[PDB]
Symmetry: D2
Subunit: 342 residues, 4 copies
């Protein structure tokens, strides 16, 4: 296969922990430049690949190094600005979430993606996580019937203050975290988003966000998310029209509840379920989705088709984010005037 | 202690499986009559206690046998009609849920309870279940802070048709099942019910009900319930203002997530939680709540105080049931006219 | 219908009050007609449930004054042994909590007395009658399970850490108070005569850890880990069969069953397994075995058949127990002899 | 900064491609400079990641033509043994997958060669370096844990069910392919010299079940259950300490830690325990041990120190392995001799 030539931007924590390692073990791709404002961070790639250029700004990299793609892991502002620059030069663009800070910015990125006709992508790794893929495959099987209801629980401890210079801690949380689980909702909903209701509770610097979504397919989704928890954890469920209930705990173990489940020593006795977890030595970046999201991005480049987590795919997710922030602004407003008056 | 004299009504399945066994091992109470339309069912109590009267109708029992209390496990219609009769005779009344079929009937029972000044009770065993009690005790402890959010998941497979001659399968499900988990919501909400939103999805003869509740205390509750599942199961969670998350799975095991949990061999290392489950030989009727609900009912009689699950305590639960049925009737109506027209 | 079996209770302490008595109280067609205890106030506790029945402070007096068909005892083995012989000579059926006696030779006297008297004798070997143990035993008798090759038993406790009932040995006390249960489970699943036993004990302060391996003529092997070197009582076990089936039972609660080629309808595959646990409202005394051990004991009386946990049934377990104590004393004798040699 | 360590790969089959190679590719400051395989097309698979580097179909040729500091092998023990001696005589550091050889006597030749050549030698004993095993080992070195009294190891597999690498024995093949890992864990936690070993093997068709017990001079005992009589590879282990602490590690994933007087802030008590598992996005090769085994091997090269899984470190495990095969052949010799006597 022809080698895909990749330039890296923002060699910080998520680049070093997850993306770079995935790229390093990724077939038929070559990393040919690294860029970071702090050039010493860029040179971290020399620990793996000697000699390749390190640059302190993206424009220099785009001008000196021939590239089929850039993979970026920085702030929304980086992804937005340089994202547009890279696309304007005909380079395919993969960025960590969030791709940008606003719906209107996303619409700008979408429009540029279409005009430049390049493959775009966002690092929505939950979508590509092996156990999530397995669940998605279940929804395609006849005996599962239809997905009626999706429940998502997404715990985190931060952010407890605004990020990237945004005024709002809620908007920061939605873009830093909930973006993942809202997108999972849109993914399993499978059909057009038809209604969104939501609410936000605050306590000190902590948040609990509840969002409910209905889809044209008839399916509903409910998300509990926030920063009022000790650490990042994630659990989801699916309820199907054939009375199948599927639970995925921590992207690790699956529990499958269905009428008339059996084992051979017992036959179909009341209350048997199926359970599944990985083997003890499960490793790499598939279970977590980093491998999958990059692999498919590159594939979409090879066959010049759409990448499933391109900018446009995020359109419904940004609408939900916007709606969650608008409703909260109204709620806050009313409560503030209430008090001001009483 | 003086012996409390108890008459039983409706010696069917739930009486034989749970209540009668709890009464039989209950200190200082005496069963002194059994009543059932099918006298052979009433005589099932002769398997345990010889000679005591068996009657085929409640009025006969109230006229011939001196009683401090009746415990009933039949249809709502039995509980309502004979409930009022027993109270009119100055007898304390314990009935299985549902105590009746409508808000207006509950209001009638409440008013009679107050006029007769007797102890009333409903067999809301989830409230009294040992693990639920443990959770409630946690909410009373300073380091827990306040309960911000309560999540309840209540799976069942039935009813898939209307019960007790009601027109509505939804109302049957709400009274047969969800009554338990809605009441748990009101219990942990602790404060006045301030808003209720809800939705009902149908598929064939199966239902998925989603209800959200907000309390004056600031706390919110979300319930997922229905008959679109293989068997009865129940999971709940609490999110507290101190970033404590508490999970109770199947009234069996508890998981307690909190900042800086430790073990002695490790110190407070990232991602340690507390877990708790009963010992292997856990038995009787405490874990499940049947013991507790009856014990406290009898106690309320001894000290002539209120029983915590008396008729009045169910007032907010019936309001939610009514609201869920009203909203569904509107939704159905609109969808029916939509089609009729298109 | 059925005739009432008349039962006297001896030893109204903790195990009588927590499990046995409650079980008896809900048992069809038996009457508790007398309670006997050294401490007449303990005997009187029955009056919380059943008025007027005679209380005695010694077994001889109860046997003279009250017509009885069976006694049920929960005291020390000295009481089980002596009063159990006395009740049997008067043609009374005898049920005793473990342990029935302190020594193998005692057990042999018991066995002999019970054969000559032609009464039903029984020991409260409740693990053996526990509903999930029954489910495990049932799989074992099914062709596709194949043969049971290996049985792993893990029995944890925190006591006794001092000798019991005036015995000299903390090891003998532990084996008689705790391990007896799991040694007997091993015999029960081994199914075949005991061919070989190896054991060892490790001591640390007042705590111990016993390991014992058993081989059976059926080819099956068993391995047991038990001691007091733990925080609390817990129990897990495993079965390995010749169809490559592994069955795990954790705390008499959940069952995991691993077998080649397990499936779900939505996935058709590797690493799928079966899981089972009771419903949330599981209650009474079946799961723990107290109900079944008693119910079978009474059935055996009515049908004049052998009760499966009679004194004889315990012979192999007391053999194992002797062999562990002998071996240990030799290991101890050596270590001490090695030391006064240094 | 650091000098680049130059690595040749030998044996580009499944374990090289799934774990070792990906680990090497993300390893700071090492360069893969050659790949060697009988099947040049397998060798060429490296070119999916690193262009142009020489491919050879034999180790001798690679050692002549390419300057190397270390080789990393993943082939049969015959290859590890012979080519491992060859690489060591040329002053090349040698890392090989298990097993490093087929026999104890081979291992001794390896140990001797490695001492004379003064190079770092190593075996891919990855369980030992697995992050959760490290956590367990760390608790063990902490005063309050007390001493480790007992170690229980359960190692399940479905293969091999036929002899491997032209060996005659399916038992030797299994011990060398699988149990080697868990025998070595036992040695590692036993901490003290091996005092005693007992074992037994049971056969059923083409499957086996090995039990082995080990005692150590530190007082610690170990008990291991391993075989092929199971659906799939799984692994769980337990530590019992003298502070009455029990630690369980299930499938290198979750840790349960039982200790007297555990607590939560909201409950202050009996039956509380600690639990731990990784976050949902846990990835790479640390958890499984491939990362750490390699990283330490390279660190040992740089510091010219001993690598903890060198050939010598494996001596006790190969001793155990011989003793299990000897014992088994005697047990077999007897059963057959008993039979031609019948
Ligand atoms: N999908 C996942 O699971 C998840 C996990 C972690 C973070 N993320 C995302 O990854 C991204 C990066 O976060 P991080 O935690 O590694 O933070 P970081 O501060 O450690 O890394 C960001 C890097 O970008 C660089 N950068 C900033 N602007 C630049 C510019 N104009 N040109 C070149 N370099 C520039 C920084 O100097 C830095 O080294 C985010 O958008 C974040 O939300 C994804
Ligand atoms: N709380 C729990 O967990 C839960 C579990 C099971 C059922 N319940 C409740 O228990 C109650 C009884 O249900 P059941 O399942 O045992 O059904 P059932 O049909 O088996 O028992 C009802 C009994 O009441 C009798 N009855 C009816 N009307 C009577 C009358 N006018 N006078 C005397 N007897 C009369 C019947 O003949 C019968 O034997 C309900 O209201 C039900 O919803 C509670
Ligand atoms: N493992 C289990 O299945 C379960 C658990 C605990 C106890 N056991 C068994 O039950 C028995 C009692 O245990 P416990 O924990 O309830 O202790 P306990 O405090 O209940 O003592 C039992 C009773 O027997 C009485 N007694 C002693 N000698 C008597 C005599 N000569 N005549 C009449 N009464 C006499 C005592 O006064 C006392 O009230 C034991 O043998 C024990 O191992 C069963
Ligand atoms: N348990 C674990 O930690 C993990 C798991 C599986 C395998 N292992 C070990 O890794 C090794 C290989 O296992 P595999 O499953 O990857 O099988 P495999 O299909 O990968 O075979 C390994 C490779 O070595 C090559 N080879 C054989 N002899 C050679 C020679 N003389 N010169 C050059 N190349 C030669 C083969 O052609 C082949 O491509 C074993 O010794 C095994 O036990 C590690």
């Amino acid at each position: 296969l022809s080698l895909i030539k990749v330039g890296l931007v923002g060699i910080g924590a998520q680049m070093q922990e997850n993306l770079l390692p995935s790229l390093l073990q990724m077939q038929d791709i070559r990393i040919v430049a690294a860029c970071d404002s702090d050039l010493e961070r860029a040179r971290r790639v020399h620990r793996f690949i000697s000699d390749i250029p390190v640059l302190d700004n993206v424009p220099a990299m785009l001008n000196q190094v021939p590239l089929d793609a850039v993979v970026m892991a920085g702030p929304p502002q980086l992804h937005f600005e340089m994202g547009l620059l890279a696309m304007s030069k005909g380079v395919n663009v993969f960025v960590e979430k969030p791709p940008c800070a606003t719906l209107e910015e996303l619409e700008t990125l979408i429009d540029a993606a279409r005009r430049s006709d390049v493959v775009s992508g966002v690092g929505m790794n939950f979508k590509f996580a092996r156990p999530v893929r397995q669940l998605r495959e279940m929804t395609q099987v006849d005996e599962f019937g239809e997905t009626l209801h999706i429940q998502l629980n997404h715990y985190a401890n931060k952010p407890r203050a605004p990020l990237w210079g945004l005024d709002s801690t809620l908007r920061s949380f939605l873009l830093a975290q909930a973006i993942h689980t809202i997108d999972l909702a849109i993914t399993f909903g499978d059909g057009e988003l038809r209604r969104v209701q939501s609410s936000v509770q605050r306590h000190d610097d902590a948040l609990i966000v509840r969002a409910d979504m209905a889809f044209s397919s008839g399916a509903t989704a409910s998300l509990l998310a926030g920063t009022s928890f000790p650490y990042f954890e994630f659990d989801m469920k699916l309820v199907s029209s054939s009375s199948t209930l599927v639970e995925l705990d921590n992207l690790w173990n699956i529990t499958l509840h269905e009428p008339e489940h059996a084992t051979r020593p017992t036959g179909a006795a009341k209350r048997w379920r199926g359970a599944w977890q990985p083997g003890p030595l499960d490793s790499g970046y598939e279970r977590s989705g980093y491998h999958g999201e990059l692999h498919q991005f590159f594939q979409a480049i090879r066959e010049h088709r759409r990448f499933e987590a391109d900018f446009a795919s995020l359109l419904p997710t940004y609408r939900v984010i916007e709606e969650i922030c608008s409703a909260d602004a109204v709620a806050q407003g009313l409560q503030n005037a209430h008090s001001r008056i009483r």
